[model samples]
Target chain A: SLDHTLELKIPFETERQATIATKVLSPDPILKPQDFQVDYSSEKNVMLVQFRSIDDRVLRVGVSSIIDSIKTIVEAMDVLSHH
Target chain B: KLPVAQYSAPDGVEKSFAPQLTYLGQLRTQLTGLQDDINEFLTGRMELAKNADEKRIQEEINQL
Candidate 1:
């Protein structure tokens, strides 16, 4: 029941990629809006994943899953962006 | 404080619970204001997935 924050910067090679990544991540609504909040933005070829959570566990689970999304984005940008 | 024992009632109990009480008190206030934003990040990734194949996808990811 503690409020915790995560201010993370995930990087991309292109501002376009960062912007695309931001747009991609923006659609998913946070599961329990009452227990968490998110702020995602792409700036200067990097992205931010800022969140406020009810506790360290909430923060941990969220950021962890968010990574799943991010890595997939990166992986997409890697081999698939060419097409 | 952690084990819930090793101390007598009243003062000892109070001493053991001091930190927990303080922390929980702070949590009550902070948590009351916070909103949960938990969600999936698939939309944040590359597209090539089928909703119908969620089970197989989960199994494949689990294998990794």
Candidate 2:
């Protein structure tokens, strides 16, 4: 069994909050809708996302890439949404 | 005066032992294959992250 961990820091700003929320609402194309799960703790300012894969090797890459894409969009939009 | 008795070993022992060995061997082979598959998958994911596109994404996240 293998586990992958990603820790993201969300800035303490309204724009950051909105950007994170929008990304959360979108689904990653690589993951089957059912395979992805997310948990958010506003107090901690943390989002925990987990992907359970049917096959670890190929699917994990796809899933991780999808998550990375979401992170990119959130960061970009954060700048736009704020400034 | 005399009565005679004969003794014989139990039956089916050899047949049962042969199949049990075959079953255990096959089970071990299957489990080993599963382990290998899992390891390969994880390694592949790490390699994918090393690619240019994924590396760029990592840089972007770091910038954010």
Candidate 3:
């Protein structure tokens, strides 16, 4: 019963960057998706993440983990740009 | 064996229920904190990437 919902918006430098982030984060399947779900979308230079979960614990865990993944992506972009 | 079997709720109450008037408020506080933390973290990361890109572009221009 994913009755609880939360949303986050992150702005990137460009629309393509935002879309790239969205596409990169969109593919992973949720563990115990019945307890939690995540959606990624982008508009202009903003990437939006929508989270739904059965309860607060699952929501907290899922959101934190996804943010960690996004941080890795951003870090990779930073590291790879020098080359 | 100190405890051979696990015991369930013994007091005829499956859950210890309190009104928890602050439950939603606490969750909202946590959610807001999470949002702020994420915002600052990603914003910093993005800025680092932007700075790197700009530096690379400047280096390229200098080499021209």
- Looking at every candidate separately, what fraction of the true A–B Cα contacts under 8 Å does it contain? 0.00, 0.07, 0.00
Candidate 2, residue A13: how far the Cα is off, in Å = 5.8
Q: Which stretches of candidate 1 lie over 4 Å from their true place?
A: A27-30, B1-64
Give the per-residue lDDT of model 3 (tens digit) for B1-64.
0001111122231211111423223433444455455445434534664567899899999999
The lowest-lDDT stretch of 10 consecutive residues in candidate 1 chain B is B1-10
Top lDDT hit: 3
State every prediction's TM-score relative to the real structure: 0.51, 0.35, 0.53
TM-score of chain A of each: 0.84, 0.46, 0.85
lDDT of 2 by residue, B1-64 (tens): 0111111112211100110333223433332343344345456555765567899899999999
Q: Best candidate, TM-score-wise?
A: 3
lDDT of each: 0.50, 0.39, 0.56
- Candidate 1 structure quality by residue, lDDT tens digits, B1-64: 1101011122122111111333323332222222222222212111222224799899999989
Candidate 1 lDDT tens digits, A12-40: 65688789888887545455877767778
lDDT computed for candidate 3: 0.56
